[PDB]
Design a protein around this nucleic acid. Sequence first.
RNA 1: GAGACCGAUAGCGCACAAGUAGAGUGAUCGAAAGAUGAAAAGCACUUUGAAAAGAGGGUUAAAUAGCACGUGAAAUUGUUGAAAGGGAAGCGCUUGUGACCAGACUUGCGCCCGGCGGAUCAUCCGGUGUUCUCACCGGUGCACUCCGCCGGGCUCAGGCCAG
RNA 2: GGGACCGAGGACCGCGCUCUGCAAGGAUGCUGGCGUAAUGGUCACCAGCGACCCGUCUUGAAACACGGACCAAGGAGUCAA
RNA 3: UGAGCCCGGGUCGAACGGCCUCUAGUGCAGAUCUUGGUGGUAGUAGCAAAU
Lengths: 110, 194, 131, 154, 170
Amino acid sequence: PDSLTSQFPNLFEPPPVPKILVTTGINGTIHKEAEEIASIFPNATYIRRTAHRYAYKYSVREIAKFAKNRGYTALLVVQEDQKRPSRLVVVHLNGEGVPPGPTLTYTIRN
Amino acid sequence: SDEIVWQIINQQFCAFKLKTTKGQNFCRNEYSVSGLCNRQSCPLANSRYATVRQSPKGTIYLYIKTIERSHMPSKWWEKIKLSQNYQKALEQIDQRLQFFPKFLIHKCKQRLTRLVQVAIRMRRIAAEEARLGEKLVPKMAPKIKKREEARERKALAAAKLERTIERELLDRLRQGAYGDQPLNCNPQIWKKVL
Amino acid sequence: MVAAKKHVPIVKKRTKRFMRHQSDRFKCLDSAWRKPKGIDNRVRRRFKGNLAMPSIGYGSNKKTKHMMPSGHKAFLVHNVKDVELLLMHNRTYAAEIAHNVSSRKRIDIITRAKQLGVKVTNAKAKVTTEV
Amino acid sequence: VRYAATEIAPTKSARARGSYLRVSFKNTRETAQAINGWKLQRALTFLQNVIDKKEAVPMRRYAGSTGRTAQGKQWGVSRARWPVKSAQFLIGLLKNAEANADAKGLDTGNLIIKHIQVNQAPKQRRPYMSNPCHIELILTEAEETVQKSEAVVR
Amino acid sequence: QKWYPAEDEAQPKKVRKAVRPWTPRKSLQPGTVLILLAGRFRGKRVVLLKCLDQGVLLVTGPFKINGVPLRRVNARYVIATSVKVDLTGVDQAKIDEVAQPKYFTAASEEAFFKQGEKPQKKPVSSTRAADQKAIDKALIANIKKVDMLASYLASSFSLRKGDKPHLMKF
RNA sequence: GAGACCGAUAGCGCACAAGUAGAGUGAUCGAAAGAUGAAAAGCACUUUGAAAAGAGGGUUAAAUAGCACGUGAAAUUGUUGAAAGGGAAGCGCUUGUGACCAGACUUGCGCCCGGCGGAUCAUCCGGUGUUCUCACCGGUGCACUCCGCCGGGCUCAGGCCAG
RNA sequence: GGGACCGAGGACCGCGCUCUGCAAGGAUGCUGGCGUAAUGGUCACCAGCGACCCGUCUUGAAACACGGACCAAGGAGUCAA
RNA sequence: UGAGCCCGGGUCGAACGGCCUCUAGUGCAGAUCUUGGUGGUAGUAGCAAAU
Ligand SMILES: [Zn+2]
């Protein structure tokens, strides 16, 4: 469709070899679940977000700029609730000079 | 009748009291230096009183109650603007609350101190929240949560995933999506396709 | 200095509850303590090997009474105006949002509590984070 | 945290229910526990043998000392009976679940009784009272393990 | 200070506990061979260079004999022995320099991307390596003079069958 | 027409088929029993089979609200899981093993330098309300003063447990 | 000289002493460790030691005697003069 | 200390809670307690009566 390709030209020529960064929410306890989400997508690496309880709280804008600079293609953030994964945020970083793209937020139920 | 008011307030009823089980009582009245209900800090039972308040615009004022404007409740309080410099505001308390009870002077300085400290804390929280970009949204309502729990069981039944995957997989075997000599299937079964 | 007020160490004489006699054998007797009134009851006579009785000697220190393990005293709030009552007592008390407070009112209580600098015991009940 | 063992997919499991059945509750519990975890063709042939007095079911919990014989050697029990009505009612629910599997698209030769359960029904208000029962059962396929390929070096 | 005290947090009473120096045991003389009892160098036979403040001791191996560098240990975590090696020729000025307590005590892209990784073991400083060599060179020469002292310091202390420490003397 | 009454084991025996059902030769005796849902929209149709029963499928915000119908406790029972069991179990003090669950200090202020913007800063001007000397608006600018903000540098401060 | 347990109180005040401050009306100083878990809870079970089934009634006392299959709801010092 | 009280998770659908006073048909393990429901006995006795 012409309207969808114009609004989102990065998603719709060929995509490069993908590279995926998976993080959790701030002070996450779902590391095993986030490692299983990272195992789902090939060429995915899991990096914990906070690195100890009283450490620096990083924003998703900062991590998106970080992974863009170090050659990644998308960022996946797995929010948590009651120590279970609850929301999947998919951030498309894309490449070269085009800005970071669409952010699709889903909810994990079961 | 300042004592007679206090006896009615303390031991019969006060609309500002909040009785907690934790060994302390709280005054809900907005013109009280401490939140606690005691004889020193009850503004109703003290004809002469002082209180430090903060305005929505960010200005901190000092309020004064005298025995003369007691029968006039609209004119209870003299409102005096406190300086933004912390030292001049502490001094402005001392000159204005001169010859007051020292409880009122000491707790107004504490109330001035906590109000300035909260304001600095308020600006540090807002700067970090703006950088973090995260807001607390309410979770799902129990009616909506029961709604999609009911429709997920009906959608999982309608999906029939294992038969849907099987049908799609054998469909791509027929059209030759895997090409000649497919790596997905053994050779004698690819011969059965033709 | 962003913590509770400096307090003496929290010492509890007993942690186990005082179970009612024969509440283990009968399902119609609750575990809530009842004083046995029989002249030959072994719990009342204070024999060895039997259940202990509540007494005033088990009472906790007054400087540590009603105090959470963090050093704050529990304070049931119902709205935003209950939180502002702890403006002067942010290190002695902690805010406990009531079970009857709705989702959006908990948002306003949580936001105000962080600004005032008071702890919330239930800060993740009906709320979630959005990026 | 911990995650409970998930249910088998409904595309692999067929259910069948019987509510308010006028059979003795205790005889159904021993008959259902006899055929639990079995293949469906074993369970159907076994229940037709109990009707034909050829095979016996074990009484373990509700064991009134009525029958001891050589048919207890198959189970290691000294108490074995021949509940005719319990086998007739359980056959009709296995054939209901096999029919439900056939309509769903299952492989009728590889059904196993994954789960079976007998519960007490409301007592029939007549000094003498009957003991009816509810019966539920889930029929699933045998697990199929596919061969994993060798990992690629890269 | 800056803030008027916002709460009833009271200042403490004036405490009358003055810091007086630690007198060590008579056995803990410089040059005494020690036996380390805990730490990663447990069971090692070291030498004591200087007794420091508040119950700690300055200790070298020397590093070319057993492998323990210039370290501090606690006096109570050490068994003191009767054998003493001569300290003549050892630079006292370098000992005073390493006895200073600061000698042993001391957000970006890179910060986020080493999270969860084991940091690499730091290679030894060139200042600490040179300070070790300036001390042990006269110590080892003194050590070589006494027969079987070098092999004794290379070996590790261990308890055998029937070794009763309440009667054994070191 | 009312109530500091009771709220379906209560209140008249009867909130409903109640002096009904039913018992006794008869005089007399005399119960139990309320609640789908906002609206029957009370499950069409396919498919097992003999039924007050299922599997699909649908209605509804919700059917684990299906005329067994709001909520749905305990006794008692089935399945699954864990542990134990040599002629009692249960209980008190204290460990230990395993399983599941929770998450410890809210984790900060003060100095210095440079820029930028504000004012409670100018013996600046106009206006409003007032307790008549205090507040609040509007327009001026940055000589001074004071707040913030951004970019550096620095300081101390802290919760628990050990030696 | 060696070991154990304990650190109550919280500006100054008092008695003193070896007086540029001290061991003199109650613990400070230094160092380290702690967030994919420091530390707790509940359950099941094992282990050492302990440990008669409650109420009523008789009697100096035990021992008899009466009540207790289990759960929910009701249930007994009230109102007038 | 305790009688008890507060919070989390699930269920659930329309009203309820704290303070200070007033009021009472106000707190249960027993009464071979009352009404209801449900056990072991027991798939036992035995097929008598009732159904
Ligand atoms: Zn008051």
